[PDB]
Structure 1
Amino acid sequence: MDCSTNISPKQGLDKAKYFSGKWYVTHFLDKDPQVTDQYCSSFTPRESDGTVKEALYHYNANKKTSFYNIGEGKLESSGLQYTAKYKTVDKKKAVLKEADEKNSYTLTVLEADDSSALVHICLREGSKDLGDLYTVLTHQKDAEPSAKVKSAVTQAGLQLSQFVGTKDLGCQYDDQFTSL
């Protein structure tokens, strides 16, 4: 699999709108999943002096378990785009597996407004692209994405209807973990 090539951050985006509150994924478009389980996800991104730190949560909707990470990266000169290396942690943020040099993800902000966002994520390990994901984000579980963000999907060359909507997955979140 190769990650999607025509991906760059939207210029003129206000980063105060992206690095704010917490995000819940309402819709995801996964190009070539290596597993068949469907996930829900929430995360809390913060930025300081061009360094991004984000608490990340995944819920396996099939098995009904969840895992936790902390991503850390630098902002590109391009705008709201960053490559993050990532710690694996328990629900209390104790560090399990250290962040290394060969596993990373690149996140690109395609749109962001007061309620909603669209982001693209390329997951890599070494020389291999492992995941290519577009996610629609909102600030509360099961809030409706904004008209501006639905527009950005169509502008990215995609069909929102082709995304998996997470409302139907029976998602469970851990809001204590994502606080901070």
Structure 2
Amino acid sequence: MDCSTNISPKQGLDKAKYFSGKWYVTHFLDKDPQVTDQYCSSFTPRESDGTVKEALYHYNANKKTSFYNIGEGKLESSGLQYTAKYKTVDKKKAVLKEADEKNSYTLTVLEADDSSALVHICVREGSKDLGDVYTVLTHQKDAEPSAKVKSAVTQAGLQLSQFVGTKDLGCQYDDQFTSL
């Protein structure tokens, strides 16, 4: 299901609060009703001199499988957003497949504070949208998102009741992979 185009970079968020530690997705919203599988995800985003690089993990809770990626792209000047190319790696961060240059994802930060964040991610494989997901993030696994981030969900036009909560899914994480 095609990504929403009504996402725009925000000015005025604090990037130091976003590019810090690791994030766990506590709640996710894929409006596509054709999907069945639910995921857990964690990632650790960094920024140096305008380049964003991040280590990413997905766990398919239905299939009990996982995959790992490293993304890299430029920090937008217009707001807290970046469009990254991604390679596939193993749990030891060895490269399994270099990036497919036709593929990218755009991550747009909607809110970020010391405990929590809200982001939107659209993954594109050339002219096909793999899909988009809104993710509520916290630094601690299974934590409660802040009031400020919960407000951002509403103010994005969304309802938190519609998100899937990951704390009940039986997630397996790889915390060594996302560690500092």
TM-score range, shorter chain: over 0.9
Whole-angstrom CA distance in 2 between matches of 1:178 and 1:95: 16
Q: Which moved more, 1:154-163 or 1:62-71?
A: 62-71
Gaps of 5+ in 2: none
Q: Is the 8 A contact 2:138 2:144 kept in 1?
A: yes
Q: Is the 8 A contact 2:104 2:124 kept in 1?
A: yes
Task: String of CA shifts for 1:88-142, please: whole Å, max 9, x gaps.
Answer: 0011001000012111100000000110000000110111211111000000001
Whole-angstrom CA distance in 2 between matches of 1:33 and 1:52: 32
Q: Which moved more, 1:6-15 or 1:133-142?
A: 6-15
1:160 partnered with 2:173: no
Root mean square deviation of aligned Cα: 1.2
Whole-angstrom CA distance in 1 between matches of 2:111 and 2:63: 32
Q: Is the 8 A contact 1:31 1:131 kept in 2?
A: no
| Alignment match, 1:87 | 87
Whole-angstrom CA distance in 2 between matches of 1:67 and 1:33: 23
Deviation at 1:34, TM superposition (A): 6.3
Q: TM-score, normalised by structure 2?
A: 0.96
Whole-angstrom CA distance in 2 between matches of 1:89 and 1:143: 28
* Structure 2 residue matching 1:149: 3-state secondary structure: helix
Gaps of 5+ in 1: none
* Structure 1 residue matching 2:145: 3-state secondary structure: coil
Whole-angstrom CA distance in 2 between matches of 1:5 and 1:104: 15
Q: Is the 8 A contact 2:10 2:78 kept in 1?
A: no
Whole-angstrom CA distance in 1 between matches of 2:76 and 2:107: 10
Q: Is the 8 A contact 2:80 2:109 kept in 1?
A: yes
* Percent identity (aligned): 99
Give aligned pairs, total. Answer: 180
| Alignment match, 2:63 | 63
Task: String of CA shifts for 1:142-163, please: whole Å, max 9, x gaps.
Answer: 1100000010000000000000
Whole-angstrom CA distance in 1 between matches of 2:173 and 2:130: 25
Q: TM-score, normalised by structure 1?
A: 0.96
Whole-angstrom CA distance in 2 between matches of 1:95 and 1:34: 31
Whole-angstrom CA distance in 1 between matches of 2:61 and 2:33: 15
